[PDB]
Design a protein around this ligand. Structure first.
Ligand code: TTP
Ligand code: CA
Ligand code: CA
Ligand code: CA
Length: 1118
DNA sequence: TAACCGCGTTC
DNA sequence: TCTAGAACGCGGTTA
């Protein structure tokens, strides 16, 4: 078993060692050395220097295998090697009686003779243990093993003991007034991935330079930049059934385009491609050279052996694809099998336990994983086309997938130009955005490139936190586990959480820098601002700019200018002037709220443990059933008398024989019905204000990890802001200088956004499943604190201006043009400090009301002496003033629309576009193109009324297209304008009992093209709604648009069935469309974006063909 | 009406 | 196995 399972494992190792040697990775062993292990003597110690590019757990011999890690290097002489570190896996046993630890030692040493290599007593800091801040430590038994198989064996042997100790004890003599097994409290750090365990304990990181010596790896801090690995990026294109997805079973690979370190190549399957293709060039932009040599080949099998032999030739340590883990690689694998080729022996690639394709020597960098996790691009923009436009700054070749299989024979040169396009986009997307980010992150996260690319951002956070915990000798907590059911007030809870961010829609309509607005200034607010002005201006200098008032020359001049503008506002409250369209958002809001308040899971105390205590409030919110327990028990007992089908000799089971999970599942389903009948309600929501103790002396390893990564992000966010300033400094006539400045902006804005998701995942991680540091309190406290801060700022903006929209940590607003705006302190050095009074007036009050004055830190660690001080890193950040902001309005009375608007810069360019269907994936294309046309038009017009009039022209043009029953439009534009695409996250089978346009479109796509359409998840349901079944629900009139593309026989059969008209003969799309459905949809968009906002601003309906709601007509009447 | 769900956004 | 969070819009269905 163990030595036997070693066989698969030790055989796979020898195969990997052979594959590695083939690709240039011979296992290097450094010479012997009897001197000292001091890194100052790196040049004298015998060894080989290399750049660490990969690492993998392995099994080595010298009958059982020894656990270890292979480390893959690129040396300085243009070569490569790998070296192995062996390291005994280990986990700990915790005891509930510290005195009797030795007894447990003697038990487990005898009990685990089968697998235990060695045993030892160690101490670690336990953050749940009393007096741990005074130096006390938890005694633990460290169990070490020869390999991970043996570690797992001991886990299997120890779990029964852990279960028997949790259950009740056997009885025996009842008049009798403990054994070694019952002192085993728990096992700890048992589920750490072994290669992570080696990377943490040995402090080794991919992307650093080491010298492999006998005593170990020595980091060469002298070596600065990364070695340059051989990078290959490839894309595959294949034949496909008409209107259907390819099947590796039958379909063949036409061509494989790739690029190796900037040199383009293309291999062709001439049995499908008509002409031999000649070397051509696709350099989409000068920065992206693209000269492609062509390798035309006879059969598909020949194409595969050319791709496999070229890979063997160049020896790539990185292979990049776009969605290659789930399409390209699985195809090349299946086609290699059919042709009697083993891809492993060929190139060393194979699917792993997650079905992804990896190798030992070469990372597989699927750029689609980066786009999905670190781009911050909308899902509508996550395709290679949009990603190339967003990040590489050009348009790549496009080609209808329905024409690719035909164009293989009709125009194969156009097919070849498309494939190389997908290839140039993948190579340069990886080389400019992915490769720098992932390999740099590997320098601080103890994972290899493949894992650093694919692991969730919560897992990345966990990796970073474990390094800090280990290096501070802090015992790792076990992964959090949810109770199988929780209760509130006797009711079974369905779900609980905390109140998140505060969002407000305060005003809708058009706002522009040239159109006047009415402001009612609170004079008592101007008094407060004048009271606060001397200290706020000092706060702007000493805190916001990290200087001193003694070095500024014009502190008084600035103060007098602001005072004057402020007093003029106090004398003239009612004003009707031009607005300043500004946005203020707290930088890294939740993280800075956490680090300011010293928030971390281990700091949340329970009043049974821990001036020292900073009490903070959050809002709990639970959703429970209305049934009380007495009811709850009733259902259960009824279920206990029923029978349940077995999960595949015994055909039935009892309720108590089932899993406690599926039990609750049945209990839930039944309790739902009962309440619906007895209470006429299934869910009851309730909000409870809760308080938690946040100890300010706890070991701040978590808090400090968040501070560090915030500063890590701020570097790139600052560089992004620096280069946005450099771009406005350059003369427009110098194209090359503006281009490079733009390229810097996109690069640093990307790097800061990728760091933004990991940073904010330190907040989400405390609520993540399996979290080693779970705390609902900490998260709720963060959210409530942010909600209190933003409403404080909104209360002030209200009194000196008009807030338009608010979300969590940001406010959009308009201020009077006369409001104190931007100033520049002048320093004795000639330097200038920038001041935005609307920003600094808020930030001063933020620090007045939300500063942590109970923040403590170890001053003297040896004597356990703490010092208390004040901390506040919460700072609003101002952007603007903008040319225009356009906010939509709700169709229903008294309500607004949140999370949707459009903002325009002074130069007319689009600044922000939030929420609207234009950006969302799928949605009705008509609404998308209408929105794409309409928002820029809000800039036209000389008055508010001429503005709405210029927009109305575009509206009525679109309304005309639909009131014309699509006669003005050609056939092509019609199919694309009236199509609504929607993605099914799961598969149709997993949607039982649900009605949706996508579900119906999928069933019909299956009933027509076949079941093969609906086998996978993520199906795109392109449909049009038919008037066919009249007065019938819409989910019933959704026809797949592919129907109008098949042969006429198939169309009539299905259209008649879907229309319930066996007499139908006109199969034109224009005759099937329910143009009334789409006209209402267009009418709904025009109401929310144009007409109803115009009414709110006092403008009679600019599009009278779209009638106001009756509530609005009645409001206008009065 | 109001509750409720799937998707994809803004935070 | 691996797995960051909550608030919200909109087109639907359901009670
Ligand atoms: C964008 C985003 C935000 N949030 C939370 C935490 C953020 O502090 C809060 C505010 O969102 P943002 O203001 O978008 O994020 P931020 O304040 O951290 O970054 P920036 O400096 O660019 O303003 O919302 C997440 O939990 N996940 C996310 O993906
Ligand atoms: Ca492709
Ligand atoms: Ca921001
Ligand atoms: Ca923010």
């Amino acid at each position: 078993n163990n030595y036997a399972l070693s066989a698969q494992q030790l055989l796979n190792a020898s195969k990997i060692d052979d594959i590695d040697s083939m690709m240039g990775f011979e296992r290097y062993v450094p010479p012997q050395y009897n001197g000292r292990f001091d890194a100052k003597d790196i040049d004298q110690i015998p060894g080989r220097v290399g750049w660490l590019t990969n690492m993998h757990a392995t099994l080595v011999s010298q009958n059982q295998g020894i656990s270890g890690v292979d480390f893959y290097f690129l040396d300085e002489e243009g070569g490569s090697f790998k070296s192995t570190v062996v390291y005994d896996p280990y986990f700990f046993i915790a005891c509930n009686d510290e005195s009797r630890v030795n007894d447990v030692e003697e038990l487990v040493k005898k009990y685990l003779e089968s697998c235990l290599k060695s045993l030892q007593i160690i101490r670690k800091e336990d953050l749940t243990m009393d007096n741990h801040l005074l130096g006390l430590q938890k005694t633990l038994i460290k169990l070490s093993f020869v390999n991970s198989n043996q570690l797992f064996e001991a886990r299997k042997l120890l779990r029964p003991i852990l279960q028997d100790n949790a259950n009740n004890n056997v009885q025996r003599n009842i008049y009798n007034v403990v054994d070694a097994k019952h002192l085993i409290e728990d096992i700890r750090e048992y589920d750490v991935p072994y290669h992570v365990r080696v990377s943490i304990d040995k402090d080794i990181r991919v992307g650093k330079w080491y010298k492999v010596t006998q005593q170990g790896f020595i980091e060469d801090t002298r070596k600065i930049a990364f070695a340059d690995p051989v990078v290959m990026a490839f894309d595959i294109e294949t034949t496909k059934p008409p209107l259907k997805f390819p099947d590796s079973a039958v379909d063949q690979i036409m061509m494989i385009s790739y690029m190796i370190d900037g040199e383009g190549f293309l291999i062709t399957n001439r049995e499908i491609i008509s002409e031999d293709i000649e070397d051509f060039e696709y350099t989409p932009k000068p920065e992206y050279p693209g000269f492609f040599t062509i390798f035309n080949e006879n059969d598909e099998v020949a194409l595969l052996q050319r791709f496999f032999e070229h890979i063997r030739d160049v020896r790539p340590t990185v292979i990049s694809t776009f969605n290659g883990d789930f399409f390209d690689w699985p195809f090349i694998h299946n086609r290699s099998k059919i042709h009697g080729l083993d891809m492993f022996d060929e190139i060393g690639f194979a699917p792993d336990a997650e079905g992804e394709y990896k190798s030992s020597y070469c990372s597989h960098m699927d750029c689609f994983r980066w786009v999905k996790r670190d781009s911050y691009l909308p899902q509508g923009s996550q395709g290679l086309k949009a990603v190339t436009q967003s990040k590489l700054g050009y348009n790549p070749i496009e080609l209808d997938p329905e024409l690719m299989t035909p164009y293989a024979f009709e125009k194969p040169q156009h097919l070849s130009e498309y494939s190389v396009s997908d290839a140039v986009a993948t190579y340069y997307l990886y080389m400019k955005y992915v490769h720098p980010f992932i390999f740099s992150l590997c320098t601080i996260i103890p994972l290899n490139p493949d894992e650093t690319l694919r692991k969730g951002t919560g897992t990345l956070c966990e990796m970073l936190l474990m390094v800090q915990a280990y290096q501070h000798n802090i015992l790792l907590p076990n992964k959090h586990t949810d109770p199988i059911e929780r209760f509130y007030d006797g009711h079974l809870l369905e779900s609980e959480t905390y109140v998140g961010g505060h969002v407000e829609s305060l005003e809708a309509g058009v706002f522009r820098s040239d159109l006047k607005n009415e402001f009612k200034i609170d004079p008592s607010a101007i008094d407060e601002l004048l009271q606060e002005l001397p200290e706020a201006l000092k706060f702007s200098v000493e805190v916001e700019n990290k200087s001193s008032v003694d070095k500024v020359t014009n502190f008084e001049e600035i103060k007098n200018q602001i005072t004057q503008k402020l007093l003029e506002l106090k004398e003239n409250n009612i004003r009707n002037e031009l607005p300043l369209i500004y946005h203020v958002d707290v930088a890294s809001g939740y993280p800075n709220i956490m680090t300011t308040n010293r928030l971390q899971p281990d700091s949340i105390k329970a009043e049974r443990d821990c001036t020292c205590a900073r009490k903070l409030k959050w809002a709990w919110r639970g959703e429970f059933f209305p049934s009380k327990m007495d009811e709850y028990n009733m259902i259960k007992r009824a279920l206990q008398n029923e029978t349940f089908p077995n999960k595949n000799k015994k055909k039935v089971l009892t309720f108590d024989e089932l899993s406690y999970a599926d039990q609750v599942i049945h209990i839930k389903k039944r309790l739902t019905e009962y309440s619906r009948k007895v209470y006429h309600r299934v869910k009851v929501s309730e909000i409870v204000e809760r308080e938690a103790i946040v100890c300010q002396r706890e070991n701040p390893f978590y808090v400090d990890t968040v501070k560090s990564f915030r500063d890590r992000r701020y570097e790139f966010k600052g560089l992004a802001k620096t280069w946005k300033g450099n771009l406005s400094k350059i003369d427009p006539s110098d194209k090359h200088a503006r281009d490079e400045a733009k390229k810097m902006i996109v690069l640093y804005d990307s790097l800061q956004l990728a760091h933004k998701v990991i940073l904010n995942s330190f907040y989400g991680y405390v609520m993540r499943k399996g979290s080693r540091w779970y705390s609902m309190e900490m998260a709720g406290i963060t959210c409530l604190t942010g909600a209190t801060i933003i409403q404080m700022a909104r209360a002030l903006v209200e009194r000196v201006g008009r807030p338009l929209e608010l979300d969590t940590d940001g406010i959009w607003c308009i201020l009077p043009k006369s409001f104190p705006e931007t100033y520049f302190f002048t320093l004795e050095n000639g330097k200038k400090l920038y001041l935005s009074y609307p920003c600094s007036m808020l930030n001063y009050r933020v620090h007045q009301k939300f500063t942590n004055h109970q923040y403590q830190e170890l001053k003297d660690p040896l004597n356990y002496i703490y010092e208390t001080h004040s901390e506040n890193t919460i700072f609003f950040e101002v952007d603007g003033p903008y040319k225009a902001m356009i906010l939509p309005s709700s169709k229903e009375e008294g309500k607004g629309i949140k999370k949707r608007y459009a903002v325009f810069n002074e130069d007319g360019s689009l600044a922000e576009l939030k929420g609207f269907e234009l950006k969302r994936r799928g949605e009705l294309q008509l609404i998308k193109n209408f929105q794409s046309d309409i928002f820029k038009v809000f800039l036209e017009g000389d008055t508010l009324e001429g503005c709405y009039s210029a927009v109305a022209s575009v509206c009525n043009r679109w309304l005309d297209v639909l009131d014309s029953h699509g006669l003005m439009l050609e056939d092509e534009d019609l199919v694309s304008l009236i199509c609504e695409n929607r993605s099914m996250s799961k598969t149709l089978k997993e949607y039982e009992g649900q009605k949706s346009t996508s579900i119906t479109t999928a069933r019909r796509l299956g009933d027509f093209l076949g079941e093969d359409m609906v086998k996978d998840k993520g199906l795109q349901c392109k449909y049009i709604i038919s008037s066919k079944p009249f007065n019938a629900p819409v989910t019933e009139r959704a026809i797949p648009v592919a129907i109008f593309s098949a042969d006429i026989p198939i169309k009539r059969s299905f259209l008649r069935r879907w229309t319930l008209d066996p007499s139908l003969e006109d199969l034109d799309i224009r005759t099937i469309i329910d143009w009334g459905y789409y006209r209402e949809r267009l009418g709904s968009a025009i109401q929310k974006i144009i007409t109803i906002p115009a009414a709110l601003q006092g403008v009679s309906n600019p599009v009278p063909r779209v009638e106001h709601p009756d509530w609005l007509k009645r409001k206008i009447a009065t």
